[PDB]
Amino acid sequence: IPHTHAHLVDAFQALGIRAGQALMLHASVKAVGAVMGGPNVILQALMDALTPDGTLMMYAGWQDIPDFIDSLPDALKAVYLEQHPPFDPATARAVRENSVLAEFLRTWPCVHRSANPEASMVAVGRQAALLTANHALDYGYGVESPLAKLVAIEGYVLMLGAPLDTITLLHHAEYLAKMRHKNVVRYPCPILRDGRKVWVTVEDYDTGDPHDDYSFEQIARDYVAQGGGTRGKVGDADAYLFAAQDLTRFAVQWLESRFGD
Amino acid sequence: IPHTHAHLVDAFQALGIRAGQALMLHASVKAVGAVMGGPNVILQALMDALTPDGTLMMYAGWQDIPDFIDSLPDALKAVYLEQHPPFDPATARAVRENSVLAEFLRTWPCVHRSANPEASMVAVGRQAALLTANHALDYGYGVESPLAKLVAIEGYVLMLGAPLDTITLLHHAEYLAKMRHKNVVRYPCPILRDGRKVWVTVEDYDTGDPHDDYSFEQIARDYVAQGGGTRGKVGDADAYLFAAQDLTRFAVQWLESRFG
Amino acid sequence: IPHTHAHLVDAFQALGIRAGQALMLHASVKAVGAVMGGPNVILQALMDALTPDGTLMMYAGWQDIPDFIDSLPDALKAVYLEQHPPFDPATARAVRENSVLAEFLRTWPCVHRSANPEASMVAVGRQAALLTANHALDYGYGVESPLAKLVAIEGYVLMLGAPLDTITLLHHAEYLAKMRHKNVVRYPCPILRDGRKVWVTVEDYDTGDPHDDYSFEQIARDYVAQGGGTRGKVGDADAYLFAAQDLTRFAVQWLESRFGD
Amino acid sequence: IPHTHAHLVDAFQALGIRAGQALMLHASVKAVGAVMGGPNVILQALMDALTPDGTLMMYAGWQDIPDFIDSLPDALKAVYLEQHPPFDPATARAVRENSVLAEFLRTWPCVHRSANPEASMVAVGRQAALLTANHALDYGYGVESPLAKLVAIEGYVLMLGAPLDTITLLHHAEYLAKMRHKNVVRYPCPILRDGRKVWVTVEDYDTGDPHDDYSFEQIARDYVAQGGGTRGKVGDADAYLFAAQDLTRFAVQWLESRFGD
Ligand SMILES: CC(C)(COP(=O)(O)OP(=O)(O)OC[C@H]1O[C@@H](n2cnc3c(N)ncnc32)[C@H](O)[C@@H]1OP(=O)(O)O)[C@@H](O)C(=O)NCCC(=O)NCCS
Ligand SMILES: CC(C)(COP(=O)(O)OP(=O)(O)OC[C@H]1O[C@@H](n2cnc3c(N)ncnc32)[C@H](O)[C@@H]1OP(=O)(O)O)[C@@H](O)C(=O)NCCC(=O)NCCS
Ligand SMILES: CC(C)(COP(=O)(O)OP(=O)(O)OC[C@H]1O[C@@H](n2cnc3c(N)ncnc32)[C@H](O)[C@@H]1OP(=O)(O)O)[C@@H](O)C(=O)NCCC(=O)NCCS
Ligand SMILES: CC(C)(COP(=O)(O)OP(=O)(O)OC[C@H]1O[C@@H](n2cnc3c(N)ncnc32)[C@H](O)[C@@H]1OP(=O)(O)O)[C@@H](O)C(=O)NCCC(=O)NCCS
Ligand SMILES: NC[C@H]1O[C@H](O[C@H]2[C@H](O[C@@H]3O[C@H](CO)[C@@H](O)[C@H]3O)[C@@H](O)[C@H](N)C[C@@H]2N)[C@H](N)[C@@H](O)[C@@H]1O
Ligand SMILES: NC[C@H]1O[C@H](O[C@H]2[C@H](O[C@@H]3O[C@H](CO)[C@@H](O)[C@H]3O)[C@@H](O)[C@H](N)C[C@@H]2N)[C@H](N)[C@@H](O)[C@@H]1O
Ligand SMILES: NC[C@H]1O[C@H](O[C@H]2[C@H](O[C@@H]3O[C@H](CO)[C@@H](O)[C@H]3O)[C@@H](O)[C@H](N)C[C@@H]2N)[C@H](N)[C@@H](O)[C@@H]1O
Ligand SMILES: NC[C@H]1O[C@H](O[C@H]2[C@H](O[C@@H]3O[C@H](CO)[C@@H](O)[C@H]3O)[C@@H](O)[C@H](N)C[C@@H]2N)[C@H](N)[C@@H](O)[C@@H]1O
């Protein structure tokens, strides 16, 4: 009754997932429904469809990032600066709202993790080191990011029962697009440097709210409506498979046509 | 008859300015009235009362600091990033609202200027290098600032027809005071590093608005009312002379009792 | 009698070269022996084993870099400052001792060349632009170098009859290693800036002599002795294939255990 | 016969010492000759000429710093790591070859001491806390040092029968100067961190030998020969009074003209 590994492998393949692809996954475990062996089998089935020559990536981030401390009373901020642990990539837990699957992949054998705390990506497979390498602290969805590299190697994005609003790649499209105005955020973050905690200022485009009157769901819905991507069932979940290069190109043109200067 | 150099020196001495003091000036040229020789003579008369063993300092800042570029359209901000000049302490003009006297002092012979663009101070005299040295870019009114040093050497603040709301030293009291919440700002600024332009992020407490329900004029008036400072006329101007250490102590206690 | 293209491809594959790898080559043409078609066929056979989704990189440097002029009399120095040509990446010849194969690759179609004159790297393939981008003038074997990026994307080093003392990647290990003594040098170099010749000063760790009592031969031989890398014949040449990340990690530990904190 | 407090005060004033100056002293007690009350009176007379508005600073260092332990056998090194006391600024004795006057000033009432063990400075007076604050452990004669601050506040250096080779400020000139070769060292040191002994590694330019073919004696003699500073007798001692800013500028130009870019 629960979905089997073999059936999930074939369901992923039916969508168009092929040996050797680099793929970034957004998922809802509940949407897929009961799997025989639990969410590990979702990851393993996807890895098997990709084969060891492919690569699987997820957005992990950092569940406990203390980027809000300026909003606290001064005396409480002082305690955070002294007592909050730094981002340690070996232990920093994935953002829970990024799916438990991101935390499962973060702790998978042979995983690689990128160094930007807020934008941290985890990946397993042939190009996992490449995708996660040299992730700049500032503008973490920009040109020196795993999203840029995913576009460059013509990777894919799989939404597995995940809302279309959660496509992290579209923050890279926001970065690229010549828009009339984008909101810049600067926030403190503790990191490790020579094995010691250092608080640094991170600069980035706001990724919590859009820069103008749009949503990622709207961009993705328009992409699908004009023939973009493939769609199909995986377990109980509605799934969408997008080519990163074409989706990014479409999204940049979409933003610039509506909100450019 | 326009006010003379001698009459200004004498009025400065009558108010309590003494040889060897370190003094930070806030002024209105218009409030002083016509001076024989112009605003140079205000500066020179004050320097003469201080003698070369004293020191005179003003808050210059940078009139053209482009700290607002994040609010501009992205395409315009890109042009600023490419074309706006960096803070060059040799040429960066003083904020006009800090008085033309601050720009006059900034271009005075033997002046020293501190390196923080937004908070830049200029000084002439025996301790001018000391006061302006190693002015940190972040928290420019804090521990690594000319204001901290002015307090440490028990200097003075002279208000020469300037409103009591303009006492820059009270931003140092804000920095020191343990208050429930202070607003932190981070803003971009172009500077010179190894002779090349570099854009850096500056972090500071907000100095454009108070951190709570107060004004500097309110603090200063309360200080005067409880016997703080000396008052007198210099030219046509109402003048106030404050000890930096006592005013800072008072303002920190004032802030902490109300907002701590 | 001469080695054929097909036999060289087979030998590279037997050694462990795989499609998609990013590979840095050190070679001796003489050690390989006569090849049917000459040294071009060595490069093409290696590129074929790597496929277009792989990358081949070599250290080119600049045969005629005038980094020695501070030692000359002022009058001769003035002539160098006036008359020596700048580093032009389109024409600057590779160091002859880096093998003629480095000069052959530098002039190969679709090559990318990194901008640091003394440390210039040349590469052909899918990650060639990535590896050669933004190569800082200072500390050219350091954090901003193609060697750092080769480690970060988990590339490989192939020794094709080249002595183990010539592994340029070990200068990156010297840069990373925390050691009791380092020599820092500053030297002059003419470059092109806005189409004009400009003399700049480059700061780097000394790469002409070791920083302490060791040799690269010593480190690499120890690496092999503990099971590092794979070995085999390619043509007449003894070949070694090393993982860049594992060799660098080993060499940093080797240096730090003897001269470190 | 023994020099009196009053006659030292007069001699310091005749040399050019003035109220309010920040002054770094290098001294020989024997060169001054017998003082009525002993070396305390040298320090007190100098403080009196400076007044409490002035500041007197000396290089104390740490007589017992175990910065040499990497050269010992592993077994003896092990005992040092276990048993050597940490740098405690309250008790760490001044280097004996820095003059007993440095230890006398280190134990003077109201003294402030900078935190860098090897480069520790002690000071008494109005800018004593300023000069000694935030003395970084790495590059202790560099930008984050009391010597940098002495230059910035336009202080002075007084040589009181001390050899001209002993001007510690010239290590700051070495740090600033752009030079063809520098030696960088890393050495161990035990310090206090949250009241517990911790061993750290300090990185600095070598200050035990020059970076090139020069001595501080040469630089200082050349400075004096071109009119730098003021000279006079204090007690039996030849004294020199130098402006820290002018001497540092001269020394940096001297080094860069001979060994610079
Ligand atoms: C928010 C969102 C993750 C919620 O989806 P979800 O299916 O409810 O949550 P998850 O995918 O984390 O799965 C949670 C379920 O995994 C199940 N599960 C199975 N084994 C588990 C295990 N060892 N440990 C924990 N949970 C386990 C549990 O049933 C758990 O549900 P429960 O806590 O209610 O018992 C989803 O709507 C979504 O948005 N996904 C895309 C997220 C994304 O990629 N965001 C990018 C940034 S915008
Ligand atoms: C805002 C404030 C400066 C305005 O006072 P003000 O007397 O009108 O202005 P200034 O002191 O700059 O003097 C300007 C006058 O100097 C005169 N002046 C004389 N010689 C001059 C010269 N060579 N060049 C320019 N102006 C000259 C001019 O008459 C000029 O007035 P005008 O342009 O209207 O003709 C004053 O109210 C104030 O706040 N002073 C304190 C400022 C301060 O210290 N702020 C700290 C940060 S909060
Ligand atoms: C120094 C070293 C290159 C010498 O090896 P080598 O085989 O003698 O020299 P090369 O690899 O340059 O091959 C030269 C041969 O290529 C041959 N060749 C074939 N076609 C050629 C052509 N069109 N043009 C020139 N030479 C050609 C020639 O026989 C030439 O030898 P020759 O000039 O004596 O006739 C080798 O010992 C070595 O150290 N390799 C590693 C180099 C390195 O990577 N260094 C990194 C910095 S330490
Ligand atoms: C090395 C140098 C200090 C030797 O000078 P010195 O006059 O022989 O030594 P000191 O200045 O330490 O004075 C020591 C004398 O102080 C006298 N003294 C007086 N009271 C004393 C007391 N309570 N306790 C100890 N000594 C006392 C003693 O005569 C002692 O000499 P002694 O042990 O032979 O009896 C001197 O040549 C020098 O180089 N000074 C500059 C040092 C410097 O600043 N170095 C910076 C780093 S390069
Ligand atoms: N792609 C649109 C999404 O925006 C928000 O999630 C973003 C997230 O926003 C955070 O959400 C927290 C509060 O929910 C804040 O701390 C924010 O920083 C941001 O910090 C990440 N860098 C990227 C995430 N995409 C929304 N939470 C999500 O529901 C929505 O689908
Ligand atoms: N706290 C009282 C004072 O605050 C403001 O001046 C501050 C000033 O704030 C600017 O004032 C402008 C409003 O005209 C804004 O651009 C602000 O950025 C800030 O740039 C300086 N760092 C410190 C100045 N004290 C007031 N201008 C001044 O009139 C008043 O006396
Ligand atoms: N570390 C091992 C290697 O070091 C030297 O080659 C280096 C080379 O050194 C030059 O060669 C001369 C002899 O050392 C120096 O004077 C420099 O000009 C240097 O310029 C490059 N930056 C890197 C090269 N690896 C050796 N020449 C080389 O044979 C040896 O394999
Ligand atoms: N500035 C020149 C001076 O160098 C030496 O003293 C230096 C001292 O050098 C040590 O002294 C040992 C032998 O000289 C070295 O091994 C170092 O550890 C060094 O540790 C300090 N950081 C700075 C001192 N200046 C000389 N002791 C001194 O006589 C000479 O005049």
List chains touching D (3+ CB pairs under 8 A): B, C
CA B232 – CA B16 distance, rounded (Å): 9
Cα angle D138-D140-D144, degrees, rounded to a multiple of 5: 90
Residue in the block written with tokens 């040093």:
B149
CA C45 – CA D231 distance, rounded (Å): 77
Question: Whose C-alpha lies nearest to ligand 4, atom 29?
Answer: D30
Listed as own residue / partner, the contacts of A200-203 with beta carbons closer than 8 Å and 24 or more positions apart are A200/A137, A201/B186, A201/B201, A201/B203, A202/A67, A202/A117, A202/A118, A202/A137, A202/A138, A202/A140, A203/A138, A203/A139, A203/B201
Distance B223 CA to ligand 2 centre (A): 26
State the number of CA atoms in the 13 A half-sphere of A195 facing the CB: 2
D110: its two tokens: 């109201």
3-state secondary structure of B248: helix
CA D218 – CA D150 distance, rounded (Å): 22
Residue in the block written with tokens 């109220």:
D19
Contact criterion met (CB < 8 Å) for D130 and B153: no
CA A258 – CA C211 distance, rounded (Å): 59
Residue (of B178, B121, B175) closest to B150 by Cα position: B121
Torsion of CA D132, D136, D141, D146, to 10 degrees: -20
- Ligand 4 within 6 A of CB of D63: no
Question: Whose C-alpha lies nearest to ligand 6, atom 28?
Answer: B166
Cα angle A174-B197-D137, degrees, rounded to a multiple of 5: 100
A203: its two tokens: 């600069």
What DSSP line would sit under A3-47, residue for residue?
BPHHHHHHHHHHHT--TT-EEEEEE-HHHH--BTT-HHHHHHHHH
B256: its two tokens: 């902490």
A64 is in an annotated binding site: no
Beta-carbon count within 10 A of C227 CB: 7
Residue (of C127, C126, C144) closest to C135 by Cα position: C144
What separation in angstroms does the CA of A205 have from each of A183, A184, A261? 6, 4, 18
Cα angle B157-B160-B164, degrees, rounded to a multiple of 5: 70
C115: its two tokens: 């901008």
Q: What is the CA radius of gyration of chain B?
A: 18
Distance A101 CA to ligand 1 centre (A): 7
- Ligand 4 within 6 A of CB of D207: no
Closest chain C residue by Cα to residue A148: C130
Element (H, E) at B99: none
Three-state DSSP string of chain C: CCECHHHHHHHHHHHCCCCCCEEEEEECHHHHCCECCCHHHHHHHHHHHHCCCCEEEEECCCCCCCCCHHHCCHHHHHHHHHHCCCECCCCCCCCHHHCHHHHHHHCCCCCEECCCCCCCEEEEECCHHHHHCCCCCCCCCCCCCHHHHHHHCCCEEEEECCCHHHCCHHHHHHHHCCCCEEEEEEEEEEEEECCEEEEEEEEEECCCCCCCCCCHHHHHHHHHHCCCCEEEEECCEEEEEEEHHHHHHHHHHHHHHHHCC
Dihedral pair phi/psi, residue B149, rounded to 5°: -70, -35
Which value in Å is the resolution of this experimental model? 1.6
Cα angle D87-D89-D92, degrees, rounded to a multiple of 5: 60
Lining residues, ligand 3, CB within 6 Å:
C 26-31, 38-39, 59, 97-101, 162-163, 166, 168
Chain B hits for D154, CB-CB cut-off 8 Å, are 129-130
3-state secondary structure of B59: strand
Distance B100 CA to ligand 2 centre (A): 5
Residue (of A92, A144, A147, A157) closest to A118 by Cα position: A92
D50: its two tokens: 């400076």
Residue in the block written with tokens 């790597």:
C50
Chain C hits for D138, CB-CB cut-off 8 Å, are none
Dihedral pair phi/psi, residue A258, rounded to 5°: -100, -35
A52: its two tokens: 């060891």
Give residues with Cβ within 8 angstroms of D253, minimum separation 6: none
User: Cβ-count burial of C197 within 10 angstroms (0-12 exposed, 13-18 middle, 19+ buried)?
Assistant: middle
Residue in the block written with tokens 């040449």:
C237
D67 is in an annotated binding site: yes
Q: Give, as one character, the DSSP assignment of residue A52.
A: T
CA A31 – CA A8 distance, rounded (Å): 13
Chain C hits for A193, CB-CB cut-off 8 Å, are none
Bridge-partner residues for B158, per DSSP?
A: B25, B241
Q: In whole angstroms, what separates CA A72 from the centre of its chain?
A: 28
The method of structure determination was X-ray
CA D78 – CA D98 distance, rounded (Å): 29
- Ligand 6 within 6 A of CB of B209: no
Closest chain C residue by Cα to residue D260: C186
Residue (of B94, B107, B90, B20) closest to B59 by Cα position: B94
Question: Whose C-alpha lies nearest to ligand 5, atom 6?
Answer: A208
Distance B207 CA to ligand 3 centre (A): 67
For the CA of B32, the nearest atom of ligand 2? 7
Q: Which residues of A touch C (CB under 8 A)?
A: 53, 126-127, 129-130, 133-134, 152-153
Listed as own residue / partner, the contacts of C39-46 with beta carbons closer than 8 Å and 24 or more positions apart are C39/C100, C39/C101, C39/C104, C40/C104, C41/C3, C41/C4, C41/C5, C41/C8, C42/C8, C42/C101, C42/C160, C43/C101, C43/C104, C43/C105, C43/C108, C44/C5, C45/C5, C45/C8, C45/C9, C45/C12, C46/C8, C46/C12, C46/C17, C46/C158
Q: Give, as one character, the DSSP assignment of residue A85.
A: P
3-state secondary structure of A221: helix
Beta-carbon count within 10 A of A169 CB: 24
Lining residues, ligand 5, CB within 6 Å:
A 118, 165-166, 168, 207-208, 216
Dihedral pair phi/psi, residue C174, rounded to 5°: -55, -45
3-state secondary structure of A141: coil
Bridge-partner residues for D124, per DSSP?
A: D56
CA A116 – CA A141 distance, rounded (Å): 10
SS3 content of chain B, % helix, strand, coil (to 5): 40, 20, 40
To probe the interface with C, which of D68, D74, D183, D184 has the most C CB atoms within 10 Å? D184
What's the first-to-final CA gap in chain A, in angstroms? 55
Q: Which residues of C touch D (CB under 8 A)?
A: 70, 178-188, 201, 261
B189: its two tokens: 């600024």
Amino acid at B229: G
CA D79 – CA D75 distance, rounded (Å): 7
Question: Whose C-alpha lies nearest to ligand 3, atom 39?
Answer: C162
Dihedral pair phi/psi, residue D201, rounded to 5°: -105, 130
CA C183 – CA D180 distance, rounded (Å): 10
* Separate counts of helices (H) and strands (E) for chain A: 10, 9
Question: Whose C-alpha lies nearest to ligand 3, atom 41?
Answer: C162
Rama region for A139: left / alpha / beta (φ>0; ψ in -120 to 50; rest): left
Beta-carbon count within 10 A of D198 CB: 11
Contact criterion met (CB < 8 Å) for A201 and B186: yes
* Separate counts of helices (H) and strands (E) for chain B: 10, 9
What separation in angstroms does the CA of B115 have from each of B92, B145, C100, D109, D229? 11, 10, 53, 34, 28
b/e for D147-177, b at 16 or more Cβ within 10 A? Answer: bbbbbbbbbbbbbbbbebebbbbbbbbbbbb
**Nearest CA distance, D123 vs chain B (angstrom):** 16
Residue (of D140, D124, D135, D153) closest to D58 by Cα position: D124
CA D27 – CA D192 distance, rounded (Å): 30
For the CA of D26, the nearest atom of ligand 4? 44
What DSSP line would sit under A169-181, residue for residue?
HHHHHHHHS--S-
To probe the interface with C, which of A53, A110, A116, A130 has the most C CB atoms within 10 Å? A130
Are the C-beta atoms of D160 and D231 separated by less than 8 Å? no
Dihedral pair phi/psi, residue D223, rounded to 5°: -60, -45
Cα angle A206-A209-A215, degrees, rounded to a multiple of 5: 125
To probe the interface with B, which of A180, A181, A205, A206 has the most B CB atoms within 10 Å? A181
3-state secondary structure of A73: coil
CA C153 – CA A129 distance, rounded (Å): 5
What DSSP line would sit under A201-219, residue for residue?
EEEEE--SS-SSS--HHHH
C30 is in an annotated binding site: yes
Torsion of CA A34, A40, A43, A48, to 10 degrees: -100
Residue (of D103, D121, D99) closest to D29 by Cα position: D99
What's the first-to-final CA gap in chain B, in angstroms? 52
D66: its two tokens: 């175990």
Residue (of C147, C89, C98, C154) closest to C116 by Cα position: C89
Q: Strand D22-27's sheet: what is its strand order?
A: D112-113, D121-125, D55-59, D22-27, D156-160, D237-243, D230-234
**Residue-level length of chain D:** 261
CA C57 – CA C112 distance, rounded (Å): 9
User: Cβ-count burial of A109 within 10 angstroms (0-12 exposed, 13-18 middle, 19+ buried)?
Assistant: exposed
3-state secondary structure of B65: coil
Q: In whole angstroms, what separates CA D173 from the centre of its chain?
A: 13
Are the C-beta atoms of B161 and B11 separated by less than 8 Å? no
CA B149 – CA B119 distance, rounded (Å): 14
CA D58 – CA D166 distance, rounded (Å): 12
- The minimal CB distance from C184 to the residues D182, D188, D261 is found for D182
Residue in the block written with tokens 């014949």:
C233
CA B71 – CA C123 distance, rounded (Å): 42
Are the C-beta atoms of C56 and C188 separated by less than 8 Å? no
Q: In whole angstroms, what separates CA C59 from the centre of its chain?
A: 3
Residue in the block written with tokens 């190693």:
B134
A141 is in an annotated binding site: yes
CA B65 – CA B77 distance, rounded (Å): 14
Residue (of B236, B226, B230) closest to B17 by Cα position: B230
List chains touching C (3+ CB pairs under 8 A): A, D
- The minimal CB distance from D188 to the residues C70, C179, C261 is found for C261
Question: Whose C-alpha lies nearest to ligand 1, atom 43?
Answer: A98
CA D11 – CA D232 distance, rounded (Å): 8
Are the C-beta atoms of D17 and D158 separated by less than 8 Å? yes
User: Cβ-count burial of C228 within 10 angstroms (0-12 exposed, 13-18 middle, 19+ buried)?
Assistant: middle
Q: At what angle do helices A169-176 and A216-225 cross, to 10 degrees?
A: 100
D3: its two tokens: 């020099």
Residue (of B260, B237, B256) closest to B101 by Cα position: B237
State the number of CA atoms in the 13 A half-sphere of B217 facing the CB: 5
A193: its two tokens: 């440097």
Distance B155 CA to ligand 2 centre (A): 24
Chain C hits for D188, CB-CB cut-off 8 Å, are 261
Chain A hits for B186, CB-CB cut-off 8 Å, are 186, 201
Three-state DSSP string of chain D: CCECHHHHHHHHHHHCCCCCCEEEEEECHHHHCCECCCHHHHHHHHHHHHCCCCEEEEECCCCCCCCCHHHCCHHHHHHHHHHCCCECCCCCCCCHHHCHHHHHHHCCCCCEECCCCCCCEEEEECCHHHHHCCCCCCCCCCCCCHHHHHHHCCCEEEEECCCHHHCCHHHHHHHHCCCCEEEEEEEEEEEEECCEEEEEEEEEECCCCCCCCCCHHHHHHHHHHCCCCEEEEECCEEEEEEEHHHHHHHHHHHHHHHHCC
A194 is in an annotated binding site: no
| Cβ pairs bridging C and D (under 8 Å) | 37
Chain D hits for C70, CB-CB cut-off 8 Å, are 180
Q: Which of C157, C189, C207 to mutate to test the pocket of ligand 7 (most atoms within 8 A of CB)?
A: C207
Distance C55 CA to ligand 3 centre (A): 22
Are the C-beta atoms of B80 and B142 separated by less than 8 Å? no
C3: its two tokens: 């080695």
User: Cβ-count burial of D179 within 10 angstroms (0-12 exposed, 13-18 middle, 19+ buried)?
Assistant: buried
D155: its two tokens: 């202080």
Contact criterion met (CB < 8 Å) for B133 and D126: no
Distance B207 CA to ligand 6 centre (A): 6
Distance A43 CA to ligand 1 centre (A): 13
**Residue-level length of chain C:** 261
Cα angle D33-D35-D41, degrees, rounded to a multiple of 5: 130
**Nearest CA distance, C53 vs chain A (angstrom):** 9
What DSSP line would sit under B115-179, residue for residue?
S-STT-EEEEETTHHHHHTT--SSSTTSTTSHHHHHHHTT-EEEEES--GGG-THHHHHHHHS--
3-state secondary structure of A199: strand
CA B19 – CA C206 distance, rounded (Å): 57
CA A197 – CA C227 distance, rounded (Å): 36
Q: Strand B55-59's sheet: what is its strand order?
A: B112-113, B121-125, B55-59, B22-27, B156-160, B237-243, B230-234
Amino acid at C211: H
